[PDB]
Design a protein around this ligand. Structure first.
Ligand SMILES: [Mg+2]
Ligand SMILES: [Mg+2]
Ligand SMILES: [Mg+2]
Ligand SMILES: [Mg+2]
Ligand SMILES: [Mg+2]
Ligand SMILES: [Mg+2]
Ligand SMILES: [Mg+2]
Ligand SMILES: [Mg+2]
Ligand code: NA
Ligand code: NA
Ligand code: NA
Ligand code: NA
Ligand code: NA
Ligand code: NA
Ligand code: NA
Ligand code: NA
Ligand code: NA
Ligand code: NA
Lengths: 1011, 1011
């Protein structure tokens, strides 16, 4: 039958979908969510053999273990065990496009398990097997007899095994196909793996049983009264003595309870559902659920007889909340949300796509700690425990059907085809049936990047009909089609329109007001965090706060999908597309997260944390105004710490309790601040600190901060004049300057400072030279590739202009003596093929104090692409342990990504001054720096810098961080100006005009001296 | 695999659905709709064998003919060949409800055909087979190899046989299952049959071919300009030299033509459809299509190469018309429709469910001739030719998906379940793909009596999304759900509410105005024409004309589903439910048509024709005002004929040409009305005659009529002194009266006229006695059954009250002689269980003229159910050839169904005075009669009467007309009053209060005399 090449067959003998069951036979266990003896895990060691096609599988395997099989753990992805390669392709399908067919060489994983079944499970009732995730399709046999088949790699497939098992040992055999017609609906941008990658379990239910239950909560106008409505369905034999009891508990207190026999109200001319009953429980003053305060109740559903014997119980956590769109705004409990979201794939660097509770918890704690309140399941239903953690920890969730056909041409070729409606329908309906009782899900999504086809419209309506409690969104076809209640673009920019034909991405501000438009706008994806990125993040947040109908967005994305590989020496390294021999592949495009695959943060996460703060601040005088962005809670776990420092020197500080209602303000007046000792800039830093631990944070967690400049007393005191004057020695080759223990050498043929000495120690490994390029970031490169150059990418523009190849031509090099110093003046031209790109004019003034003041004035031809940076660089001979500076920090920060950084005095080990992005590039810059100290050296001025053991040339020549090698000494890059890093997207230029170095003429000044 | 017990498998290897194709290889043949050499019929003689279950089919059958098979004609329903019995069940499924399973005993029809295939069809191109209709599911093999499987008995299933055929002789094998999971979606109220019942054909297409085409017509505001847009899709290898030309013809004139290479506009980020192209042709002053003037153009779509070589051509008739709902009104070409519709099942009394062109044309003509302008395909897509005929003759059509699950409990059990969404979706999507180019289809329907489930909502939106040109309707779930653009109830009454829980049927006038309601209302079924019915039809038409938003309805239904059976002598008779041994069955409920199975009309058809007239008239003095209800045409084929008669005697007449614009009025002044010379009532009758023949009627066709009373001159002339005086002979047991050669005898113990003689000839077989009951109509019976009485039905109320058992008790019988007459006075009480139900007091006055004047005064107890009639009856000794009367006629008419009858002098053969309803009952009445003549007798008065060879007793005791036998003499029923017949529905009391005999006291008088 080749059922795996027929979209008309997505399953055979599979049971209906339904919310999470456990068939407790003790009600108290159900109340507390304790393990159920009726729900057993079959996870652990199984037998597995790999074959190249289903045709190669031997018949013997159905009845007997293959001697050649290996023993492996399940769940797992077989690529993670080395049986074949995982493939990283973004848009292009990994298989030839020829629906509904798949390749004849189709990797097949033959899994089997011998396991015991107690006779008690078989004497009465039904025993079913549940496979929570099998990628991408499979057949199942039990004790050699075929049971059924299933597709949709991201929802559970359940089969009744009652008539196939026997007391004692039994053997299951599962043949899993890597590719199937379901693969045409699974083209998400992620590694392509396969296997039994989610839990496998066995569930026993009585013959008369709860087969489905739906929980709804509806409220009065002020949310002070609710009615909990629980519709319960049974399968099995109806009898007048059956009853359903639904009880609701808040902790250990029972809030309400109702009992009824089965028999629903009349629905139509034929009657009602004799096999269903709806219980309605009044709840006064319910404690409401939100991501701010995830209050939960427990609904316990008992099926029992009138005389009181329990048959079984099921149950769920219940969050009383209403979600609705009114007057153009998405409201939660009547108040407008501000979504601080992130897209999150299920990815683990060692386990592939298998998820575990520890990793789930770690992700949610980091998310909450970084001020996220929402997550989008990009792009498929997740492992079931995810929803339970979001309900309990408190995160809003977008639950999304496992439908993506991005590689089709045009993209809606399948979604507008009715023959594909059935298969798509089950991906949407099975998801709603399974997850509709979770309060954390607040919005349903129809899938991702599958264009806009009529199947979408049909499905959108089906959901609207079966569950009116949550909005439906879908971005395909232009983000504002008739299949979405929310305008949900991906990568639309704040102010800049991208008027692509048919599916333009308008500026978000403009989009809201197009003629006739009235829906809320929440980006389904924005701020693509690939590599050194998140440039322009603050521009989205300023817009979200100013426009009511801009209600936020989901950043793309949480974690890099890098996989671990081992080198010849056994040492692990982070790999990306193409590193497994996979081709074609999309190389580093699989790494776009705020965090590395092991959960270590990238520097961008701090930027997100700051912009997503829940407290806003203004300063007038010495009065700090604190405004709360919480909608529901008072600031009952927060105090404000304030500190004033002079040039990094602490002058004073205090603490004040914060007591701010949701949406309210608090005014705090600072104390009189005595006058500072000397000249400099006073800076005020305030932080919101939570003194008590929460379920998601430690005592002392800092949730928000902000700084302002206070008074400045510019320095007017003349410097203590030199007890000595430097001496110049002129030679045909060089100009040398000597001052005590110091010596400076300027090469006359190159016009650069080629050497410096302290005592008898040389300080430089490479001379001090102008630098106008950077090792290109992912955002500078975009989709450009050696074999398919994208001439529009910044990297290509610079390359084509000769920026990386330009040679300095000396125009002038002279020396003069002044009354107290020596003055060296140079001028160089950087040219390429005859064109002068940049002119650098400098003066170096060395005085009796030993200080060398460098003044730089650069001209940049108006018609050359604006350069990545304007600065100097050199390789110092020394390697020191610490980097100390007065400037923005402590983490890496760039012009268009520096809001989270604070101006203060920071000191870190040198290695923290390098950010190990998997794909190496310019990194580690710190901006707004007035003093930098390293080894015996100090530089002062107003510049940006980076310092590390890797030169820019090395970073640009190296594709994987594991291949980098520390160079001799230390590379210092000191910039007067640096271009923004961008990131609205990583496939087109995204650096906004205000962060491009287009001024034509630039000036900067540095003082270099000893420490 | 048992694919026929799995709603997840509705087909295997079936090709996509598409509009009618013929693969012409000459464009002019395509233009002219001539027969195509590439489309062959395989209809004719096939081999067939019946089996009790698919398991019983011998494997030998795949490879070769079974010797036991018979040779039979295809298309056919195997029940009509006598292989098994057809079943008539209305709501209750004919199989146990245990979805998706079917009985193990499942009648299987094995059909096979040996036929030739030309090598030219195989050497290039694709040869497919098309089964237009297979009930209910089937497997297909070709030359012993399995091809595919299909479900949905009402849409074509097609399969590519290219790789299975060989030049020369080939053999097809088709195993047809009577029952399948598809049957759960085919519970329509009609005979349950099976087989290959619609056409089987072979279609040859080139490898590079037109695979689909959609034609749309949009207009400017006054319809003076149109844009024809034709989207064309291809299959095969794309090549830059390919082209599509679409040309539009109006008769022989080429109106427009456009050509383009393939390549549609960009649709989304991935591009557009390289395999499609859209041609747009401008049309100025298009001739618009409507049921009034079905103007059609012809669109020819040619697939060819750039040098002009034709590859193939497809084509369709195009009707320029726009259908839209605006401000609560259904508009066609901007004018609000008034639907004069009827539901029509595909039924032939001899061939079952097989349709032929002659029967379809016969139906179409009679419909048009009877002023119908629309038809609803109750309840499945029809044979393809039906739409061609509607497009060309001009009828608005409601095309309805084959989905009816009436027998489920509750009704939406399957339609609300997502697991049945796929199967249902195909029944809707495939109908749309097939019929969307037909102009006659103006509204899509989601099926019938399947409750309201979310699957309906999903499919309603799918339609609206793919074809915005036609509204979508669906009655299930209360008739005004979110799945319907039109409020379309079935059997909702005009003024009376039927507030059933959950799905009330409101009075239609009230429904329109319920709070918040704004849609138009068109009944999908009304005026159930079962048996002697159509009572109150005029009430619906008065309301549709008074209320703009009441836009008409579809009467239930066109033709009785009776089947022919043959008695011992081979004579045919009409059979209904249970007559084939089918049980359970719903007896006569399958006969609800305006016409009998053979197309002979029932009397109700004339009432429908009159109320659905397109001309309305008013009279004011000598002025007749004619108003046209046509929306688009002028009365260019009509003249008004008028006639004035005095009591039936013609006084004057004339004709005036009609020249009225659509919706306009014309005033016609009648000439001076010379006075009449005699007492009597003058009556004016007018008729609209079409002088010229049309495609649907003959010259002389009468399309409308109306009558009015004009002056009346009451008779004040004293008769004249009688030549003689009757004599009274009194005896112990009788009062006899003699006058000339006539004698009357009144029995003194019974109190009735027991005998009357002309000479020595007795004139009565039974005495003249009062009668208060009638042989019950289907509407009087409803669903009541001897085995399950419905105490609320009229017949049961009458029975229970003793109406049929009450016996006359004499209260008084006296005789007096007057100056010139003898007077007999009598009084009788009718009692039951000691209660007096009725009292009848009469006088018989016999005078010198020989006339007997009868006065009747009756009392009816207030607490007894209102009686069916208040009259007298007798069995006359003689039988005469003709019946002549001055009253309403000529056809049968009842109080609530007499608008179409006209007052005049009529004369018919006695048998025309009996209506042969298959299920016999009271029939043949004529009301408003002032004089009745039969043999030598004459009765004068103001009464209603029926006259025939069958007593009411026999009619009520006989269930099939074929078993009635003429009694001796003639039974005459003369009524002073008769109850209405009702018909709003035939399962609950439906006679309106104003037509019930509830006055308590009634008076009538008659004169019987010799002629
Ligand atoms: Mg499949
Ligand atoms: Mg226990
Ligand atoms: Mg054993
Ligand atoms: Mg994608
Ligand atoms: Mg700030
Ligand atoms: Mg099936
Ligand atoms: Mg029905
Ligand atoms: Mg009339
Ligand atoms: Na906002
Ligand atoms: Na590549
Ligand atoms: Na990516
Ligand atoms: Na606080
Ligand atoms: Na690099
Ligand atoms: Na109307
Ligand atoms: Na019956
Ligand atoms: Na019927
Ligand atoms: Na005329
Ligand atoms: Na009868």
């Amino acid at each position: 039958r080749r059922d795996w090449e027929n979209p008309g067959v997505t399953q055979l003998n599979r049971l209906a979908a339904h919310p999470p069951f456990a068939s407790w036979r003790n009600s108290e266990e159900a109340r507390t969510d304790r393990p159920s003896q009726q729900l057993r895990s079959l996870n652990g060691e199984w037998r597995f053999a790999w074959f190249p096609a289903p045709e190669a599988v031997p018949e013997s395997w159905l009845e007997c273990d293959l001697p050649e099989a290996d023993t492996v753990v399940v769940p797992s992805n077989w690529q993670m065990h080395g049986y074949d390669a995982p493939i990283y392709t973004n848009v292009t399908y990994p298989i030839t496009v020829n629906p509904p067919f798949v390749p004849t060489e189709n990797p097949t994983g033959c899994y089997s398990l011998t396991f015991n079944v107690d006779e008690s499970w078989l004497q009465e009732g039904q025993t079913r097997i549940i496979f929570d995730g099998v990628n991408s399709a499979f057949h199942l046999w039990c004790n050699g007899r075929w049971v059924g088949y299933g597709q949709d790699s991201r929802l559970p497939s359940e089969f009744d095994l009652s008539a196939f098992l026997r007391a004692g040992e039994n053997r299951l055999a599962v043949m899993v196909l890597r590719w199937s017609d379901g693969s045409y609906l699974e083209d998400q941008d992620m590694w392509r793996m396969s296997g039994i990658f989610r839990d496998v379990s066995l569930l026993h239910k009585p013959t008369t049983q709860i087969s489905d239950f739906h929980v709804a909560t509806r409220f009065n106008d002020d949310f002070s009264r609710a009615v909990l409505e629980a519709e319960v369905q049974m399968c099995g034999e109806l009898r007048d003595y059956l009853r359903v009891t639904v009880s609701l508990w808040q902790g250990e207190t029972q809030v309400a309870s109702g009992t009824a026999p089965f028999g629903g109200e009349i629905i139509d001319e034929r009657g009602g559902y004799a096999d269903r009953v709806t219980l309605r429980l009044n709840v006064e003053n319910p404690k409401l659920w939100s991501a701010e305060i995830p209050n939960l109740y427990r609904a316990v559903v008992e099926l029992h007889t009138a005389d009181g014997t329990l048959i079984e119980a099921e149950a769920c956590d219940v969050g009383f909340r209403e979600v609705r769109i009114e007057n153009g705004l998405l409201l939660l409990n009547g108040k407008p949300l501000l979504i601080r979201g992130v897209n999150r794939h299920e990815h683990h660097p060692l386990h592939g796509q298998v998820m575990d509770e520890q990793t789930m918890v770690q992700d949610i704690l980091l998310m909450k700690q970084n001020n996220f309140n929402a997550v989008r399941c990009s792009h498929y239903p997740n492992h079931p425990l995810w929803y339970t953690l979001c309900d309990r920890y408190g995160l809003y969730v977008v639950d999304e059907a496992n439908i993506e056909t991005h590689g089709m041409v045009p993209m809606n070729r399948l979604t507008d085809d009715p023959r594909w409606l059935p298969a798509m329908s089950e991906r949407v309906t099975r998801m709603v049936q399974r997850d509709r009782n979770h309060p954390s899900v607040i919005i349903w999504s129809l899938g991702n990047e599958s264009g806009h086809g009529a199947n979408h419209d049909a499905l959108y309506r089906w959901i609207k009909s079966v569950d009116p409690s949550r909005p439906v969104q879908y971005e395909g076809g232009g983000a504002d089609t008739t299949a979405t209640d929310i305008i949900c673009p991906m990568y639309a920019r704040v102010d800049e329109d991208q008027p692509f034909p048919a599916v333009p991405k308008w500026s978000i501000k403009k989009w809201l007001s197009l003629p006739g438009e009235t829906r809320p706008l929440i980006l389904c994806e924005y701020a693509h965090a690939m590599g050194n990125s998140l440039g322009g993040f603050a521009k989205y947040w300023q817009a979200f706060r100013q426009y009511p109908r801009l209600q936020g967005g989901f950043v793309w994305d949480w974690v890099d999908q890098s996989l671990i590989k081992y080198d010849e020496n056994g040492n692990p390294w982070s790999a990306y597309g193409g590193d497994f021999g996979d081709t074609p592949n999309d190389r580093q495009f699989c790494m776009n997260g705020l965090v590395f695959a092991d959960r270590t943060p990238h520097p961008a996460l701090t930027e997100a944390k700051h912009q997503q703060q829940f407290f806003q601040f203004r300063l007038s005088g010495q009065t700090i105004e604190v405004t709360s962005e919480y909608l529901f809670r008072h600031s009952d776990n927060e105090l404000l710490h304030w500190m004033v420092a002079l040039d990094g020197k602490p002058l004073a500080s205090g603490e004040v309790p914060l007591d701010v209602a949701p949406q309210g303000k608090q005014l705090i007046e600072l104390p009189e601040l005595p006058q500072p000792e000397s000249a400099g800039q006073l800076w005020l830093t305030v932080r919101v600190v939570q003194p008590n631990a929460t379920a998601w944070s430690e005592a002392g967690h800092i949730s928000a901060w902000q700084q302002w400049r206070l008074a400045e007393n510019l320095s007017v005191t003349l410097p203590a004049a030199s007890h000595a004057i430097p001496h110049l020695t002129t030679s045909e080759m060089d100009f040398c300057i000597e001052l005590g223990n110091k010596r400076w050498q300027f090469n006359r043929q190159s016009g650069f400072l080629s050497q410096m000495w302290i005592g008898d120690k040389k300080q430089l490994l490479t001379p001090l030279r102008d630098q106008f390029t950077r090792a290109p970031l992912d955002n500078d490169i975009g989709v450009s590739e050696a074999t398919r150059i994208d001439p529009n990418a910044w990297v290509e523009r610079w390359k084509a202009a000769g920026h990386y190849q330009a040679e300095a031509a000396l125009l002038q090099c002279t020396a003069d003596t002044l009354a107290d110093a020596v003055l060296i003046t140079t001028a160089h031209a950087w040219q390429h093929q005859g064109k002068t790109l940049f002119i650098s004019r400098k003066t170096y003034r060395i005085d009796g104090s030993g200080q060398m003041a460098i003044t730089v004035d650069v001209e940049v031809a108006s018609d050359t692409p604006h350069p990545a940076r304007i600065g100097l660089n050199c390789q110092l001979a020394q390697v020191a342990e610490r980097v100390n500076w007065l400037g923005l920090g402590p983490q890496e920060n760039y012009p268009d990504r520096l809001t989270a950084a604070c101006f203060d005095r920071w000191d870190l080990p040198l290695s923290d001054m390098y950010t190990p992005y998997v794909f190496p590039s310019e990194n580690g810059l710190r901006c707004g720096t007035r003093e930098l100290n390293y080894g015996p050296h100090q530089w002062r001025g107003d510049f940006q810098f980076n310092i590390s053991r890797y030169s820019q040339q090395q970073l640009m020549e190296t594709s994987h961080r594991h291949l980098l090698h520390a160079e001799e000494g230390t590379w210092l890059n000191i910039d007067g100006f640096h271009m923004g890093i961008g990131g609205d997207d990583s496939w087109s230029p995204s650096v906004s005009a205000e962060f491009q170095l287009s001024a034509g003429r630039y000036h900067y000044q540095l003082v270099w001296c000893q420490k």
